[PDB]
Structures are given as structure tokens and as C-alpha cells.
Amino acid sequence: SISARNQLKGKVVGLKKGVVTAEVVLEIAGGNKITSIISLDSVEELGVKEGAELTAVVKSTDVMILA
Amino acid sequence: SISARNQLKGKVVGLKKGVVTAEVVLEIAGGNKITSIISLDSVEELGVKEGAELTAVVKSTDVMILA
Amino acid sequence: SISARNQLKGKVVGLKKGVVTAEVVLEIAGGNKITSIISLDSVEELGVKEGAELTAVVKSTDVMILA
Amino acid sequence: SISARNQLKGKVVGLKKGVVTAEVVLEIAGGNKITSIISLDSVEELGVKEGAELTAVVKSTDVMILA
Amino acid sequence: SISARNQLKGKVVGLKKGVVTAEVVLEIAGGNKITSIISLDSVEELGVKEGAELTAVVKSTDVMILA
Amino acid sequence: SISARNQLKGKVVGLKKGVVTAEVVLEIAGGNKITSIISLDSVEELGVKEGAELTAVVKSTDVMILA
Ligand SMILES: [Cl-]
Ligand SMILES: [Cl-]
Ligand SMILES: [Cl-]
Ligand SMILES: [Mg+2]
Ligand SMILES: [Mg+2]
Numbered sequence: 304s305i306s307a308r309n310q311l312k313g314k315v316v317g318l319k320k321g322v323v324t325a326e327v328v329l330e331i332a333g334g335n336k337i338t339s340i341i342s343l344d345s346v347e348e349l350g351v352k353e354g355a356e357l358t359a360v361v362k363s364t365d366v367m368i369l370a
Numbered sequence: 371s372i373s374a375r376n377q378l379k380g381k382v383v384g385l386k387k388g389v390v391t392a393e394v395v396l397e398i399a400g401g402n403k404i405t406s407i408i409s410l411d412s413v414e415e416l417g418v419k420e421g422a423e424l425t426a427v428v429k430s431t432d433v434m435i436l437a
Numbered sequence: 438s439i440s441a442r443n444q445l446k447g448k449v450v451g452l453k454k455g456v457v458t459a460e461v462v463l464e465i466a467g468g469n470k471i472t473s474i475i476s477l478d479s480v481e482e483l484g485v486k487e488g489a490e491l492t493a494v495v496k497s498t499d500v501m502i503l504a
Numbered sequence: 505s506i507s508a509r510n511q512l513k514g515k516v517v518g519l520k521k522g523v524v525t526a527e528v529v530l531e532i533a534g535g536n537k538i539t540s541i542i543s544l545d546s547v548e549e550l551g552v553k554e555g556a557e558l559t560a561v562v563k564s565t566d567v568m569i570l571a
Numbered sequence: 572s573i574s575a576r577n578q579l580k581g582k583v584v585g586l587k588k589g590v591v592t593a594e595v596v597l598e599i600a601g602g603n604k605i606t607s608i609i610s611l612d613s614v615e616e617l618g619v620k621e622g623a624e625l626t627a628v629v630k631s632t633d634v635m636i637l638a
Numbered sequence: 639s640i641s642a643r644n645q646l647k648g649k650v651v652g653l654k655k656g657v658v659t660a661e662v663v664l665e666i667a668g669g670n671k672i673t674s675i676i677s678l679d680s681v682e683e684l685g686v687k688e689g690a691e692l693t694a695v696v697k698s699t700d701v702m703i704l705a
Contacts, residue, residue, distance in 0.1 A: 305573065305628060306613040306703040308405040310436070321457035323656035323675060326476060327435055333399025338375040339433035340457060340476060342631050342661060342675060345574035349437040358436040360573060363610050364498045364699045365432035366406035368394060368440040369377070369425040370416040372439065372494060373479035373569040388591035390522035390541060393610060407591060407610060409497050409527060409541060412440035427439065430476055431565045431632045435574040442539040444570070455658035460677060461569055467533025472509040473567035474658060474677060483571040492570040498699045499566035500540035502528055502641040503511070503559040504550040506640065506695060507636040507680035524589035524608060543594060543608060543698055546641040561640065564677050565632045576673040578704070595703055600668025606643040607701035617705040626704040633700035634674035636662055637645070637693040638684040 309361040313337060315353055320346065327351055329359050376428040378404055382420050387413065394418055396426055443495040447471060449487050454480065461485055463493055510562040514538055516554050521547065528552055530560055577629040581605060583621050588614065595619055597627055644696040648672060650688055655681065662686055664694050 316336070317328030325346040327339045337359040351357065380396030383403070392413040394406040404426045418424065450470070451462030459480040461473045471493040485491065514530030517537070526547040528540045538560040552558065581597030584604070593614040595607045605627040619625065651671070652663030660681040664672045672694040686692065 304617060304705050305436075306607075306609040306617060307434070308610060308613060311402050319457060321455060321656060323654060323659045323661050324457045326430070326457050326478070329435075331400070332402055335378050335399055335402075336376075337428075337433055338430045338476070338478075339435055339574075340430040340632075341433075341435055341574040342576060342673070344661070344673075345435065345576060349435060349572060349574060351435065355437075360434045360436050361428050361432055362700070362702060363393065363405045363407040364608075365428055365496070366404055366408075367374070367427045367496060368406055368408055368412065368416060368418060369427050370418070370422075370438045371483060371571055373473075373475040373483060375476060375479060386591055388522060388589060390520060390525045390527045391591045393591045393612070405610070405612075406440075407498075408440040409442060409539070411527070411539075412442060416438055416440060429566070429568055431474075432630070434630055437572050439570075441568070445536050453658060455656060458658045460564070460658050460679070463569075465534070466536055469512050469533055469536070470510075471562075471567055472564045472677070472679075473569055474564040475567075475569055479569065483569060485569065485571075489571070494568040494570050495562050495566055497527065497539045497541040499562055499697070500538060500542075501508070501561040501697060502540055502542055502546065502550060502552060503561050504552070504556075504639055505638060505684060507674075507676040507684060509677060509680060522589060524587055524592050524594045540641075541699075542641040543606070543643060545594070545606075546643060550639060550641060563633070563635055565675075575702070577671075579670050594698065597703075600670055601666070603646055603667055603670075605701055606698045607703055608698040609701075609703055613703070617703060619703060619705070623705075628702040628704050629672075629696050629700055631661070631673045631675045633696055634672055634676075635642070635695040636664075636674055636676055636680065636684060636686065637640075637695050638686075638690070
């Protein structure tokens with residue numbers, strides 16, 4: 304278990320690979336979408352591809368509130 | 371509009387105020403919960419309180435992927 | 438209103454687009470310059486281009502102090 | 505020199521100490537204010553105090569753009 | 572497995588609890604120390620305490636380079 | 639001196655340059671490896687290259703704990 308309190312299960316619905324990073328779009332429950340930019344190495348290692356079941360993890364101090 | 375692509379609508383179900391920061395917990399669609407730690411100053415200025423409808427925003431580079 | 442307490446108005450003076458991300462340079466008051474790396478999708482969506490008036494937003498917990 | 509491309513000189517106009525963190529407010533050129541939340545331990549070691557001339561540093565990937 | 576490429580095993584040598592967050596200090600291989608500020612809720616749930624063997628994880632986009 | 643409490647001295651053992659960003663892999667004491675994604679401008683400016691002695695700097699609120 305990791306300290307990051309946001310752990311949202313999702314399915315990949317978009318993937319764009321660059322040279323250093325890749326953009327991963329996950330659909331999570333309720334139809335929300337989360338977009339992640341991570342290293343291309345991690346995409347490759349985790350075998351990220353359309354339909355993959357993965358979890359989006361965000362540290363609490365990175366979540367802003369919009370009112 | 372802001373460049374942060376993740377905007378998750380939610381309702382505050384928990385709030386703990388510290389001296390410098392506060393922890394806000396939002397229930398989002400599908401029952402997922404998002405936890406945010408922001409400055410106490412912002413909580414006050416945005417009038418964040420239990421039950422409030424608000425939106426969590428996260429920059430894509432802050433979203434990690436777990437497999 | 439967003440919780441991020443740093444909101445600096447600026448004008449775009451530099452833009453470099455990659456495949457996933459783009460680098461945006463804003464000149465803010467007093468001659469300071471802020472450089473941002475964000476998703477290319479956002480640049481495109483916000484119509485970022487030289488001279489555009491935009492605001493740089495930074496969460497407090499991301500600001501370091503150098504003495 | 506550090507890779508963080510944003511280095512903004514300023515003067516501390518506010519300081520609030522908590523137990524683990526502290527909020528530092530710096531006035532920068534043009535009157536902009538930058539707000540930083542850092543560890544209390546750092547405030548102590550860098551001798552951060554009201555009126556001190558200090559520099560705020562932000563990594564480019566933490567700067568969002570608002571339009 | 573998670574996309575965050577940096578995973579550093581360590582032993583807790585310091586722990587300071589606040590109301591919202593907690594500061595965890597880990598000694599890692601070679602004697603380097605890593606300092607983490609996470610939510611108090613997580614410290615409790617992961618049962619973080621002095622002497623515990625734990626792993627520090629950091630997303631690559633959060634590591635700055637200083638020369 | 640900078641407020642970020644993690645300052646890990648290391649040597650570059652991997653470098654991959656993209657158009658906006660670059661991935662830098664540093665070996666630090668004890669054989670630990672740190673991977674950083676930073677702006678290509680900074681890579682160029684700091685003259686990052688294999689064997690360079692540099693320091694990985696991470697803010698405490700970016701360090702997660704895995705148990
Ligand atoms: Cl967290
Ligand atoms: Cl903030
Ligand atoms: Cl820090
Ligand atoms: Mg952060
Ligand atoms: Mg970040």
C-alpha cells in the first residue's frame with residue numbers, strides 16, 4: 304500500500320506516445336476521465352495499451368479545489 | 371479555462387483544518403473519493419465546508435499510473 | 438476560483454511544441470518570466486500563441502524557497 | 505544552478521508556522537505575491553523571517569496555464 | 572507496480588506528526604536521508620513508526636536536477 | 639541553499655533527449671538510481687551528459703511512502 308490517498312481504478316481509452324513521455328487517458332467510474340502524462344519507459348513497462356485496467360494515483364497535495 | 375485536464379466534480383464529505391493546511395475529502399461520481407490537502411487560507415476564502423459541491427483539479431503530470 | 442494561491446498574469450513570449458507536451462514562456466509584471474511545461478492538448482485547446490494573455494497558476498506546496 | 509527554470513526574487517511579507525509546514529508569502533517585482541508551503545524545518549534552517557529577501561523557485565512542470 | 576520510477580528502500584529515523592500531515596524521515600542506502608511530508612491519515616493506516624522499513628517513491632517529473 | 643530537503647548527489651548514467659523534455663538517470667550512493675524528467679532547456683544549460691555529477695532535488699511533499 305502507498306501513501307497517495309487518491310487511487311482511482313480505470314480503463315485506458317486514449318494513449319499518445321512521445322519520445323520521453325506518453326499521455327494516458329483513463330476512464331474511471333461514473334464516466335469521469337483522468338489524463339496522465341508519465342514516462343514512456345513506464346508505459347512500456349506496464350504494458351499500457353487501449354483497454355488496460357490500471358489505477359490512477361495522485362498525492363493529496365497535488366489536488367486543487369475549484370469553487 | 372485552465373490547462374489542468376482533470377476536473378472531477380464532487381461533494382465534500384470530510385474536512386479537517388490544520389494551521390497551515392486543511393484536508394478536504396470529496397465524494398465523486400461512482401462513489402470514488404478524492405482527498406486534497408490545500409492551504410487553510412484557500413479553504414476559508416473558497417468557503418469550503420461539509421456538503422459543498424466543488425471540483426477537484428489535478429495537472430496531468432501529477433497523475434501516476436499503477437498496474 | 439481555484440485554491441492555488443499563485444496566479445500570475447502574463448503574456449506569452451515563447452512557445453515550443455513537442456508531441457505530448459509544450460513549453461510556454463510567459464512574461465509577467467516587472468520583467469519576471471515564468472516557464473511552464475503542459476500537455477500539447479491544453480496548448481491547443483487554450484489557443485496558446487505568442488502574445489496571448491494567460492495566467493500562470495502554481496500550487497503553494499510546489500513553490501520552493503532559495504536563500 | 506538548478507534545473508527549475510522559474511526563479512523569482514522577493515521579500516517575505518507573511519509567515520505562518522505550523523508543526524510540520526509553514527506558509528511563506530513573498531512580494532515579488534510588480535507587486536505580485538507568491539505563496540509557498542514548505543517544511544517548518546526548512547524555514548528554521550534557512551532562517552526565513554518577515555522582511556527577508558529570498559527567491560521562490562518552481563519547476564516548469566508544476567506551472568499550469570489559465571486562460 | 573506503479574509508473575513512479577524512483578523507489579528507494581529505507582528505515583524511518585524520524586517522524587513528526589501534525590494535524591493534517593506528518594513528516595517522515597527515512598535513512599536510505601549509503602546513509603542519504605529522504606524526507607517525506609504525507610497525510611497524517613496515511614501514516615496511521617500504513618502504521619508508519621520509527622524503525623519501520625518502508626520505501627520512498629517519487630514521480631520522475633518531480634525530480635529537479637542541481638549542478 | 640534551497641528549502642527542498644531531499645538533495646541526493648549522483649552521477650548521470652542515462653540520458654534521453656526529447657524535444658521539450660529529457661529523461662536523466664542518476665546513480666546515487668548505495669547503487670540507488672533516480673530518474674528525472676526535466677526541460678530540455680535545463681539539460682542543455684546545465685550541460686547534462688553521461689558521467690556528470692549532479693544532484694537530484696525533490697520537495698518533501700512529492701515523496702510518497704510505500705509499505
Ligand atoms: Cl496523499
Ligand atoms: Cl495553493
Ligand atoms: Cl521540502
Ligand atoms: Mg507536487
Ligand atoms: Mg508535481
